[PDB]
C-alpha cells in the first residue's frame, strides 16, 4: 500500500509510486527520475499514464519496454494541464532527466514536490521566485551538519589533474570508472576528454546513455574497448580482484589501472579536504573514492528552505525511524526560528 508522502492532496496525483499495484483513485503517475528505487514497479504491461521529463521518457520506453501510448513527455519551465490541474517541471540539478514538480492545487495550494535534487542558488530564479509554496515534499537524503562534500567543479577538477598526471607519466596506464545507475557522467566524460579519447563500456551501458540527450555524444562514447583507454565498469567490480581480472582482458595493452568509485558522503569528508585525497593501492592498482553528490549537502538544503519559507515540510527521505524523524523536525524548527517565518 501506497505512503501518504507519495500523494498529493486533492488530485488523483502519486509521485515515484509504481511497487503499490493500482492505487485507488490514482488518474496519473507521475516520475521524478529514472533511478530504481523511484521507478520500482514499471514494465511493458503497465497500462497507466505516466507523466515524467523527455529524457526520463526516452529511458522508459527502450530500457524498460513501457508502451509509447502511456507516455506522456513534458517540456520543463512551461505551464502545463494535466487532468484538469496546472504543473510545471523544473530541472532538479540531480541525474540526467530529473526533475521537480510544481502542483497549482484547485483550492489555491502550491505544493513543491524536489523529487531527488542537489539545491542550488539558481534555482531562486526559476518559476519559484514568482509565488508562494505551501507545502514542501523534500529530499532530506543529507539533513543532517556532518554531511558536507565539495562542489561537483572541485571534485571534477581533481579527477582530471589525478587522471592526466598519471597517463603522462605512463602512457600504458588505463583508466577504469564505476557506474550503477545513470548520474554523475561528467566524471568518466571529463577524463575522456583530457585524455583525447572516447569512454569504452558494454552495449547495455551505451544503450542508456544513448537515451540522454548529451550534445555530440556519438563523439564522446563507444563500445569498441581496444580503440579506448577509459572504461566503465559496473560499481561492483572496482575492487582489486575484478580491476586485476579486467587487466588481464586488454591483451597486454596496459600496465597499470587507475580507477575511480564516485560514491556519495563517506565518513572520511569529516577529516580531509578534496586536495588531500589518497587512494588505496596493491601493485600496479590504484583506487580513488571521490564524493561526487547529487544530492544537496546540509548548507546547500538549508539554504534552499530558508529561502522558499514553506508553510509546511514533508520529507521524504531517511522517514523510517523515530530517530530521524525526531532530528529533521529539529532542524527545520531551527531554521523557521532563525530566519523568521
Ligand atoms: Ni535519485
Given amino acids: ?14 509521485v515515484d509510486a509504481f511497487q503499490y499495484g493500482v492505487v485507488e483513485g490514482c488518474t496519473a503517475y507521475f516520475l521524478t527520475h529514472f533511478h530504481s528505487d523511484h521507478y520500482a514497479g514499471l514494465s511493458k504491461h503497465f497500462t497507466f499514464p505516466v507523466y ?22 513534458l517540456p520543463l519551465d512551461t505551464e502545463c494541464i494535466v487532468n484538469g490541474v496546472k504543473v510545471v517541471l523544473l530541472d532538479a540539478n540531480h541525474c540526467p532527466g530529473a ?24 534555482m531562486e530564479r526559476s518559476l519559484l521566485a514568482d509565488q508562494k509554496v505551501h507545502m514542501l ?15 561537483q567543479q572541485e571534485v571534477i577538477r581533481f579527477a582530471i589533474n589525478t587522471a592526466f598526471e598519471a597517463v603522462t607519466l605512463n602512457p600504458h596506464a588505463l583508466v577504469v570508472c564505476g557506474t550503477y545507475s545513470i548520474g554523475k557522467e561528467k566524471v568518466f566524460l571529463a577524463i575522456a576528454d583530457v585524455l583525447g579519447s572516447k569512454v569504452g563500456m558494454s552495449q547495455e551501458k551505451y544503450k542508456t546513455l544513448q537515451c540522454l540527450n548529451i550534445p555530440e555524444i ?3 562514447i563507444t563500445t569498441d574497448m581496444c580503440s579506448s583507454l577509459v572504461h566503465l565498469l559496473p560499481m561492483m567490480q572496482i575492487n582489486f580482484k575484478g580491476l586485476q581480472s579486467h587487466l588481464k582482458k586488454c591483451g597486454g595493452k596496459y600496465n597499470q589501472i587507475l ?18 585525497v589518497i587512494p588505496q593501492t596493491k601493485g600496479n592498482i590504484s583506487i580513488y573514492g571521490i564524493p561526487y553528490s547529487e544530492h544537496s549537502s ?5 539554504r534552499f528552505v530558508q529561502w522558499l519559507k514553506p508553510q509546511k515540510i514533508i520529507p521524504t527521505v531517511n522517514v523510517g525511524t523515530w530517530k530521524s524523524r525526531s532530528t529533521m523536525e529539529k532542524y527545520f524548527r531551527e531554521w523557521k526560528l532563525e530566519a523568521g517565518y
Fill in 137 to 151: 515534499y523534500l529530499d532530506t537524503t543529507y539533513c543532517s551538519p556532518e554531511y558536507t562534500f565539495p562542489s
Fill in 218 to 220: 556519438n563523439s564522446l
Fill in 52 to 73: 515524467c521529463s523527455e529524457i526520463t521518457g526516452n529511458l522508459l520506453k527502450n530500457k524498460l519496454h513501457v508502451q509509447e501510448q502511456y507516455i506522456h513527455p
Fill in 298 to 302: 546540509y548548507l546547500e538544503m538549508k
Fill in 1 to 14: 500500500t501506497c505512503p501518504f508522502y507519495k500523494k498529493i492532496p486533492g488530485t488523483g496525483f502519486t
Fill in 259 to 276: 580507477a575511480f568509485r564516485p560514491t556519495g558522503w563517506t565518513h572520511s569528508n569529516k577529516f580531509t579536504r578534496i586536495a588531500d
Fill in 99 to 122: 526533475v521537480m514538480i510544481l502542483f497549482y492545487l484547485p483550492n489555491g495550494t502550491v505544493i513543491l514536490h524536489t523529487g531527488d535534487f542537489r539545491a542550488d542558488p539558481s
